[PDB]
Ligand binder design. Structure first.
Ligand SMILES: CCCCCCCCCCCCCCCCCC(=O)OC[C@H](CO[C@@H]1O[C@H](CO[C@H]2O[C@H](CO)[C@H](O)[C@H](O)[C@H]2O)[C@H](O)[C@H](O)[C@H]1O)OC(=O)CCCCCCCCCCCCCCCCC
Ligand SMILES: CCCCCCCCCCCCCCCCCC(=O)OC[C@H](CO[C@@H]1O[C@H](CO[C@H]2O[C@H](CO)[C@H](O)[C@H](O)[C@H]2O)[C@H](O)[C@H](O)[C@H]1O)OC(=O)CCCCCCCCCCCCCCCCC
Ligand code: CLA
Ligand code: CLA
Ligand code: CLA
Ligand code: CLA
Ligand code: CLA
Ligand SMILES: CCCCCCCCCCCCCCCCCC(=O)OC[C@H](CO[C@@H]1O[C@H](CO)[C@H](O)[C@H](O)[C@H]1O)OC(=O)CCCCCCCCCCCCCCCCC
Ligand SMILES: CCCCCCCCCCCCCCCC(=O)OC[C@H](COP(=O)(O)OC[C@@H](O)CO)OC(=O)CCCCCCCCCCCCCCC
Ligand SMILES: CC1=C(/C=C/C(C)=C/C=C/C(C)=C/C=C/C=C(C)/C=C/C=C(C)/C=C/C2=C(C)CCCC2(C)C)C(C)(C)CCC1
Lengths: 137, 243, 57, 96, 176, 448, 170, 36, 29
């Protein structure tokens, strides 16, 4: 097995559009994930709130849907709860609250896409391991 | 007055606030206002456990016990609804707060008696027609006593209610019918009776204080054995303010 | 209960135990050191001292 | 001598989300229930029937529309003490 | 892989509880003790056969006299520890006996384990524990650990068994 | 400079410098150079790999947090506003190492072999009790001055970083240092156990600055004392007066100081700000209980009456003396004090009403931040417990500092035992072995 | 199973096929007679452990609510204890006895697991209530289920090795 | 580091290891004189 | 990128070079 263009082909928006990231986009797409996300989101779970993981199936049932690139990029700009009723920028790292989360300051628009892509590509690789927990270690 | 750094390590943190002996007044109760207990505190001073008399005709006696879990026994910052029943009698319905403390006492002989000193879901009422709370007002009511352990608790052999084994895996081919009471856990829920007698009243601030006497059952260990009847005596404090 | 030395401690005063019970049936009593356990401890310590003394003599 | 929790798995509790017993983290399996509506349901528990969840005071028209769409995923059984005590409905001690 | 071998014997055999491994531990640790206490004693009871601070130059392989004082070494440990060696030959033989015997004892234990004939349990305590859910020792606590090891490591440690354990059957404490 | 003449082998070659004041001077000055060298080279290294917006304790830094604590290059919340002071400290220390390195080499391989007949002031003898106390006095004054430099920095030159500063951590000038001996020496008489913590439990800069004022004057006065005086009779008969003996006395001292430093960086979050070093062990554990209390309360949980599996409170319980504390396994850490938690602390401990209504988002951010940055990491720097998978590259600076200085402290204790034992034997005349012909035991009566 | 399939091929009912199985043959198919299940200080005969075998209870056939036959995973010799897991003919897990009940999905209650016995003393009988079915499932990890006399020797229900094991060890 | 000192970035990443080399240098000098 | 390796080269050899120079010069080693 290898990192094929079919694997790196992730949903772009809410209407079925698709994009294919390069291998290098995925690689530093992981570095940036380890830079500002892995502290709470290592392995696809959430240490500060285990009830919510980064599994594709979970992101899909989120409001608004986060199972695409634009959905995750929008979340990294303005994060909300699982039903989207409240905005949680004051307790979740974002560009909107980059002042209290300094590691979100120097993240370009291109950087968020790589981060979003990595979250979508990994479960297509690790399967149930991504967002699984210690059970799948 | 006094900060955390003045009280820390002293044991005063387990003590309920006291009123000066000057506080023998009365607190007026208006029928058209709504009242609440902003803070309720219960400090036990004596744990009496009804022993179990052999088996003949004896009158069951409450023997003294020894606390072994140190000063971790008080219930504090309990708040709830202070209702004015139109008959004049008041009624306190407990809502939230530290309304439970696990306590272990040791009887003569060495037998330790674990219990859940609590006042959860307490509904205590007074005598009819109470225009003011005096130094004669006493509260009578009942409360719920949930299981000492919750459903996730596992015994030394890994058995439990909402979790764990359902048999003795150390005895694979043993007759499970005799170990039924030990293999099958049961969540208990009984009623407890408590009397809150007021002896001090500050009508200005709305603070009341006195002694109490509660009766409840002790831990039954998920239904493994029979619980002991416990009688808890101590002092209490309460601040009353309009809603 | 086939108790042999127990009644002899009881005969001369020792009626209490460190665990809290007394042979009279009373509870919540304080025998102090000279309980059934305290007496036993005394005779054991005494045994050891007499042993060392025997080695010397 | 019966395990009450195991026995409850033989009811609708083992099938759907019991509004009177099931842990609050279960409302994540469906859209627009967690955490706002989830909090309200558990707080206003128990209910005599499933459709009583529509009678919670303060619900907006969109919220009541979401509740109706998930009535098929909800159920109501007798309140089990072993499942509601210790605040287990908000945290039953399970994570990942 | 050896570390895995160690943990396997704990979870499945309860190899620590076996009195033959226990004797093996006493042989190894006891040997290391003897090794250290003999080498330190000799070096700190040496005779002065030179004037250099580095006392290694003061020895000759063909000399007849002893390089250290047995008499002084004997009085030291007799007052410090109570007993002391007084025979060099029995001493060095004892340094042979202790670790050799120990490894032989542990070998006997493994031969038993080959047939899963382990020292896994104490029957008197299992009967007590099964009847009394408030009885807990460090022995029972360790068994819970073994059961955890087994159920969590087996599906990957024994892939030929094709073990599939749903999360709900896995033995877990609270929270963790 | 060989074994036949000196009596020492090559693996103990530095023991030949015992009676050579000249070369020994060059050795110490050269080693001093190595110290100042590393202090500068590492600083430049840390600054080179430093990322401003990214936390210090996520970049494996130990020296920059020290400079930051002194108030240089940091602002409100411990945020880095200027990296230039870090550069100056690194450069100045580094350049100075060339100076100490120059005289270190000179005094060693071409300076006079002995200082005693170059100079009577610099030349010394180990067994000269007057000369040793005098040198001891000089260096005592030097240490006293250094302590006043910290005081001067805190009171006259910018100040220090106060993590307990109102409105959040910030650089603050200490204007009222604690001079009360009931407080300063009160720390010295505190228990080393839980709830007390000896001198480690110092929680305000006022006690720190005021403390270094005391030790400043004490060392100076003590310095003047040992310069003007000579060892009393009871002191002359108690100690061993030789080069190796003095070394062992210092080895025991540094060993003790090593153990003290180990406990400081692991427990204290005042002189070791959490914004720079990361959360302490107790701190992170309390933050987890804090983090899930907040999360559950938002869901509608009554954390005051929430009973746990064991019967104890799931979120809140009582300490043995009755203080309201965080529940769970963190009950052991109820003596933790941090600026992010104290706003919720009342007279009887944690106030449930402050918990229900007054908790702020910045407290929630800090709790989650410190929970996920607990000082637990592998040797190859994998963050979290041992069972954690590879992803986060993190080991808290506190872990590096506590572990390293315990290894050193223990070995220096061994050093004390080694060099003191030999100092006794040498001064008595049997460090080279038992005289075959005056074996002391053979002249003693049998034990039995 | 070969003898049963041969019986079903000859035109015998399921109750007849399993009834034609010798009790001596079913007894060999029981892990309590495995010499690698004893203990070093578990002394005495095997009857001191699981007890004295009285009779065969018959083969246990497990089915869910769909009517699909399920097979209990048997215990390996290395395991002092073993979870209860039921799979289909393909080996896909369909039912189990859960440790944690909060997120249980394969419990006997949910899947409606029943058990029918063929041959032995329980021939032609079927049990439906979950605590009873579980009890047989726990025995099904040992292989064929038998009735034991545990009162005569005061058996502690703990497996002991055969003279085959003891000879090999010695 | 300041952008003016970005020249010596590879040099900076080497400096911390230099003290350790002094420990190794002592063995070279001793090996050179044959461990007298 | 391997300027890396050039630094440790000259710095690392700087030590032994002194020893080599003091040897061929037969200095006070
Ligand atoms: C094996 C054979 C042994 C034979 C005998 C030889 C004995 C000595 C052996 C020394 C080790 C040899 C290999 C060295 C390679 C190495 O280490 O290389 C590792 C690092 C450089 O590698 C970098 O290591 C980093 C470590 O993370 C650090 O930096 C990260 C990113 O900033 C994070 O901030 C993290 O929190 C922080 O810990 C990252 O993983 C980087 O990605 C990685 O490139 O070298 C460094 O650090 C250099 C630091 C060394 C001196 C300081 C040691 C401090 C020890 C304190 C504790 C003492 C007690 C220990 C008990 C055990
Ligand atoms: C020569 C003279 C010898 C005299 C011997 C006889 C005297 C006894 C000496 C002590 C013996 C050990 C006692 C336990 C030491 C300990 O638990 O030390 C712990 C204390 C710190 O204690 C903690 O101190 C903390 C202070 O932090 C508090 O205040 C902080 C302020 O920033 C924070 O706010 C923080 O949140 C808050 O909790 C708290 O009080 C904690 O409750 C408390 O546990 O450290 C300290 O006192 C530092 C001093 C002890 C250092 C450790 C010694 C280790 C010795 C190793 C020996 C090896 C032998 C090898 C032989 C071969
Ligand atoms: C205090 C801790 C402690 C101690 C001191 C011991 C001591 C012992 N354990 Mg135990 N053990 C412990 C804890 C401990 N154990 C714990 C907590 C567990 C978990 C349950 C175990 C699990 C465990 C297991 C699973 C085993 C032991 C065994 C042993 C024995 C090993 C003997 C040995 O050296 O074999 C080393 C091996 C040999 C001596 C064989 C010969 C090796 C040849 C000579 C090597 C040749 C090398 C070659 C020339 C060069 C190679 C070079 C190359 C590497 C580059 C010994 C009695 C073993 C045992 O009982 O064996 C009978 C065993 O299998 N232990
Ligand atoms: C901290 C480390 C340290 C220091 C400062 C010293 C210092 C000293 N040792 Mg010791 N030594 C050390 C470690 C150290 N040693 C270790 C680890 C060992 C074990 C291998 C030894 C083994 C040892 C022995 C066996 C002996 C000494 C001796 C000496 C003294 C004379 C050395 C001499 O003449 O060399 C001559 C060497 C040279 C001329 C070669 C060049 C040496 C210089 C210093 C190199 C400088 C390099 C540096 C980059 C220059 C920068 C200059 C400028 C830019 C600042 C000297 C005071 C001797 C002694 O006691 O004599 C009385 C002696 O016999 N040492
Ligand atoms: C530990 C420190 C120390 C000590 C005790 C000595 C002692 C000695 N040195 Mg050495 N020396 C040292 C460090 C030291 N040196 C260093 C670091 C260098 C490199 C710069 C030198 C370079 C050196 C040379 C080149 C020579 C000596 C010589 C001497 C002798 C005469 C000194 C004299 O007359 O000073 C007189 C000095 C003063 C009256 C005032 C000095 C003021 C100083 C520089 C600063 C004071 C402020 C403060 C303390 C600075 C602290 C800095 C830092 C530690 C924080 C004497 C044996 C001479 C010798 O042996 O000739 C045969 C000689 O030629 N030294
Ligand atoms: C680096 C520090 C240092 C050093 C190495 C020395 C070394 C010396 N001093 Mg000096 N001294 C110092 C600092 C120092 N002093 C300072 C700063 C002052 C000013 C306060 C003094 C004041 C002073 C006086 C007044 C005297 C000395 C004397 C001495 C000599 C004997 C010391 C002795 O017997 O101690 C060992 C001490 C004891 C055996 C007494 C009991 C000590 C108890 C057991 C300490 C318990 C500590 C505890 C475990 C941990 C600390 C916590 C808390 C309890 C405090 C020796 C030459 C004596 C001398 O001969 O002068 C000519 C003398 O009379 N010193
Ligand atoms: C080859 C020898 C052998 C074997 C394989 C068996 C096998 C059997 N015997 Mg038989 N038996 C034997 C010899 C043997 N026996 C002998 C010689 C006698 C005469 C005394 C008996 C008397 C006997 C009786 C009376 C009974 C049996 C029974 C049994 C059965 C159960 C055994 C059991 O539980 O053992 C338990 C084994 C152990 C607990 C292991 C002991 C390990 C020792 C103590 C280790 C010693 C270590 C050492 C001291 C340390 C050295 C240290 C070093 C530094 C030197 C089994 C069929 C029982 C049965 O079922 O009867 C119907 C029964 O009642 N046997
Ligand atoms: C003559 C010397 C003095 C007599 C012996 C003194 C005691 C020595 C130690 C004996 C321990 C024996 C077990 C004690 C427990 C017990 O009661 O057993 C009691 C057991 C019998 O077991 C009993 O059986 C009964 C029914 O018959 C009941 O089931 C009882 O419950 C059961 O206890 O006695 C034996 O098994 C004796 C035979 C042992 C055979 C051992 C074979 C393996 C030997 C390995 C040797 C090499 C390994 C060591 C190398 C070094
Ligand atoms: C000095 C370097 C570090 C040494 C650490 C401790 C080693 C010695 C500890 C001995 C304790 C046993 C009980 C006393 C045992 C005892 O009494 O020993 C006696 C022995 C006799 O030496 P002398 O008395 O002749 O020498 C003492 C002085 O006068 C110097 O000559 O002492 C030594 O040889 C010390 C040698 C030190 C220099 C060589 C040390 C080599 C260390 C190797 C480190 C390896 C590191 C890698 C590991 C992974
Ligand atoms: C005695 C002895 C010894 C030792 C010696 C020593 C230890 C020495 C030291 C020495 C030293 C200790 C030296 C030092 C030096 C230093 C230096 C030389 C520095 C420099 C610096 C610089 C050059 C800087 C630069 C810069 C700048 C200016 C800015 C920033 C950047 C840069 C970096 C570029 C031995 C053992 C070997 C042997 C023999 C004997």
């Amino acid at each position: 097995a290898e990192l094929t263009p079919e694997v790196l082909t992730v949903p772009l928006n809410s209407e079925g559009k698709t994009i294919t990231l390069t291998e290098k986009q995925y690689l530093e797409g992981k570095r940036l994930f380890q830079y500002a996300c892995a502290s709470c989101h290592v392995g696809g779970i959430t240490k500060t709130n285990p009830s919510l993981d980064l599994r594709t199936e979970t992101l899909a049932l989120a409001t608004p849907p986060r199972d695409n690139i634009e959905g995750l990029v929008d979340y990294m700009k303005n994060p909300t709860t699982y039903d989207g009723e409240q905005e949680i920028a004051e307790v979740h790292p974002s560009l909107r609250s980059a002042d209290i989360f300094p590691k979100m300051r120097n993240l370009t628009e291109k950087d968020l896409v790589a981060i979003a892509g990595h979250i979508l590509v990994e479960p297509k690789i690790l399967g149930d391991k991504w967002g699984g927990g210690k059970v799948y270690y | 007055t006094l900060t955390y750094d003045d009280i820390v390590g002293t044991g005063l943190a387990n003590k309920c606030p006291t009123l000066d002996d000057t506080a023998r007044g009365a607190y007026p109760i208006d029928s058209s206002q709504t009242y609440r207990i902003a803070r309720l505190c219960l400090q036990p001073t004596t744990f009496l456990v009804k022993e179990e008399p052999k088996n003949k005709r004896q009158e069951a006696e409450f023997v003294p016990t020894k606390l072994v879990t140190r000063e971790t026994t008080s219930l504090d910052q309990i708040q709830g609804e202070l209702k004015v029943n139109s008959d004049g009698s008041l009624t306190f319905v407990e809502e939230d707060g530290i309304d439970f403390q696990p306590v272990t006492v040791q009887m003569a002989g060495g037998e330790r008696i674990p219990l859940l000193f609590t006042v959860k879901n307490l509904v205590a009422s007074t005598q009819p027609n109470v225009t003011s709370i005096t130094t004669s007002t006493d509260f009578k009511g009942e409360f719920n006593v949930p299981s000492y352990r919750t459903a996730n608790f596992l015994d030394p052999k890994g058995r439990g209610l909402a979790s764990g084994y359902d048999s003795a895996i150390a005895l694979p081919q043993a007759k499970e019918e005799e170990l039924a009471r030990a293999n099958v856990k049961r969540f208990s829920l009984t009623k407890g009776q408590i009397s809150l007698n007021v002896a001090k009243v500050d009508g200005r601030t709305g603070e009341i204080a006195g002694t109490f006497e509660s009766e409840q059952l002790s831990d039954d260990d998920m239904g493994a054995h029979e619980p002991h009847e416990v009688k808890i005596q101590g002092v209490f404090y309460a601040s009353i303010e309009p809603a | 209960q086939g108790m042999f030395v127990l009644p002899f401690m009881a005969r001369l005063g020792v009626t209490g135990s460190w665990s809290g019970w007394s042979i009279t049936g009373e509870t919540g009593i304080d025998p102090g050191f000279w309980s059934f356990e305290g007496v036993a401890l005394a005779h054991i310590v005494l045994s050891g001292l007499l042993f060392l003394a025997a080695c010397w003599h | 001598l019966v395990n009450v929790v195991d026995e409850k798995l033989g009811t609708a509790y083992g099938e759907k989300i019991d509004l009177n017993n099931t842990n609050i983290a279960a409302f994540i399996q469906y859209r627009g229930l967690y955490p706002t509506l989830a909090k309200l349901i558990v707080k206003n528990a128990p209910y005599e029937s499933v459709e009583d969840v529509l009678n919670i005071p303060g619900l907006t028209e969109r919220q009541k529309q979401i509740l109706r769409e998930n009535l098929e995923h909800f159920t109501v059984t007798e309140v089990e003490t072993a499942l509601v005590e210790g605040g287990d409905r908000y945290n039953n001690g399970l994570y990942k | 892989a050896i570390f895995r071998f160690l943990l396997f014997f704990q979870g499945f055999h309860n190899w620590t509880l076996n009195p033959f491994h226990m004797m093996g531990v006493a042989g190894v640790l006891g040997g290391a003790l003897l090794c250290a206490i003999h080498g330190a004693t000799v070096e700190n009871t040496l005779f002065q056969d030179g004037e250099g601070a580095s006392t290694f130059r003061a020895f000759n392989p063909t000399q007849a006299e002893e390089t250290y004082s047995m008499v002084t070494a004997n009085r030291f440990w007799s007052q410090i520890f109570g007993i002391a060696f007084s025979n060099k030959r029995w001493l060095h033989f004892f340094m042979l006996f202790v670790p050799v015997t120990g490894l032989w004892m542990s070998a006997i234990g493994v031969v038993g384990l080959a047939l899963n004939l382990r020292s896994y349990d104490f029957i008197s305590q299992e009967i007590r524990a099964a009847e009394d859910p408030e009885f807990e020792t460090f022995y029972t606590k360790n068994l819970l650990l073994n059961e955890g090891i087994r159920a969590w490591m087996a599906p990957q440690d024994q892939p030929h068994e094709n073990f599939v354990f749903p999360e709900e059957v896995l033995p877990r404490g609270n929270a963790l | 400079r060989d074994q036949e003449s000196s009596g020492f082998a090559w693996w103990a070659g530095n023991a030949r410098l015992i009676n050579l004041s000249g070369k020994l001077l060059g050795a110490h000055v050269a080693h001093a150079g190595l110290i100042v060298f590393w202090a500068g080279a590492m600083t430049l290294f840390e600054l080179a790999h430093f990322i401003p917006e990214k936390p210090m304790y996520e970049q494996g830094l130990i020296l920059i947090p020290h400079i930051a604590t002194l108030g240089w290059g940091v602002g409100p919340g411990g945020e880095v506003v200027d990296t230039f002071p870090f550069f100056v400290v690194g450069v100045v220390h580094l350049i100075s190492s060339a100076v100490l390195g120059f005289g270190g080499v000179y005094h060693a391989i071409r300076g006079p072999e002995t200082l005693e007949e170059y100079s009577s002031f610099f030349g010394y003898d180990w067994k000269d009790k007057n000369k040793m106390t005098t040198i001891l006095g000089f260096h005592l004054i030097v240490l006293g001055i250094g302590a006043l430099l910290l005081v001067a920095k805190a009171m006259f030159f910018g100040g220090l970083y106060d993590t307990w500063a109102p409105g959040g951590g910030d650089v603050r000038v200490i204007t009222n240092p604690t001079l009360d001996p009931r407080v300063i020496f009160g720390y010295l008489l505190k228990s080393p156990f839980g709830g007390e913590g000896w001198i480690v439990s110092v929680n305000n800069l006022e006690d720190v600055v005021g403390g270094h004022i005391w030790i400043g004057l004490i060392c100076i006065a003590g310095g003047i004392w040992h310069i003007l005086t000579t060892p009393f009779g009871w002191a002359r008969r108690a100690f061993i007066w030789s080069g190796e003996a003095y070394l062992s006395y210092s080895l025991g001292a540094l060993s003790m100081m090593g153990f003290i430093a180990t406990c400081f960086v692991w427990f204290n979050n005042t002189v070791y700000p959490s914004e720079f070093y990361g959360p302490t062990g107790p701190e992170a554990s309390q933050a987890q209980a804090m983090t899930f209390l907040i999360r559950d309360q938002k869901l509608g949980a009554n954390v005051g009456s929430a009973q746990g599996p064991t019967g104890l409170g799931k979120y809140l319980m009582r300490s043995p003396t009755g203080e309201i504390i965080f529940g769970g396994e963190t009950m052991r850490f109820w003596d933790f004090r941090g600026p992010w938690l104290e706003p919720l602390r009342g007279p009887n401990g944690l106030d449930l009403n402050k918990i229900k209504n007054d908790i702020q988002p910045w407290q929630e951010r800090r709790a989650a931040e410190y929970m996920t940055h607990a000082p637990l990491g592998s040797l190859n720097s994998v963050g979290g417990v041992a069972t954690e998978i590879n992803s986060v590259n993190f080991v808290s600076p506190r872990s590096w500092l506590a572990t390293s200085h315990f290894v050193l402290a223990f070995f220096f204790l061994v050093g004390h035992l080694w060099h003191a034992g030999r100092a006794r034997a040498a001064a008595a005349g049997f460090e080279k072995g038992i005289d075959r012909e005056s074996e002391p035991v053979l002249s003693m009566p049998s034990l039995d | 199973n070969r003898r049963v399939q041969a019986s079903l091929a000859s035109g015998a009912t399921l109750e007849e096929a399993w009834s034609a199985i010798p009790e001596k043959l079913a007894f060999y198919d029981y892990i309590g007679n495995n010499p690698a299940k004893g203990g070093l200080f578990r002394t005495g005969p095997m009857n001191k452990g699981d007890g004295i075998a009285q009779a065969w209870k018959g083969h246990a056939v497990f089915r869910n609510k769909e009517g699909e036959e399920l097979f209990v995973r048997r215990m390996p010799a290395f395991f002092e204890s073993f979870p209860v897991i039921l799979t289909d003919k393909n080996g896909v897990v369909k039912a189990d006895i859960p440790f944690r009940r909060a997120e249980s999905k394969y419990s006997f209650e949910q899947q409606g697991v029943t058990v029918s016995f063929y041959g032995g003393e329980l021939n032609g009988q079927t049990f439906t209530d979950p605590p009873t079915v579980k009890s047989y499932a726990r025995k099904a990890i040992f292989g064929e289920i038998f009735e034991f006399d545990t009162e005569t020797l005061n058996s502690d229900g703990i497996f002991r090795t055969s003279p085959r094991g003891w000879f090999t060890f010695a | 580091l300041p952008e003016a000192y970005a020249i010596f970035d590879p040099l900076v990443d080497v400096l911390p290891v230099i003290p350790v080399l002094f420990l190794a240098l002592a063995f070279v000098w001793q090996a050179a004189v044959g461990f007298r | 990128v391997i300027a890396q390796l050039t630094m440790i080269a000259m710095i690392g050899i700087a030590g032994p070079m002194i020893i080599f120079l003091l040897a061929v010069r037969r200095g006070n080693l």
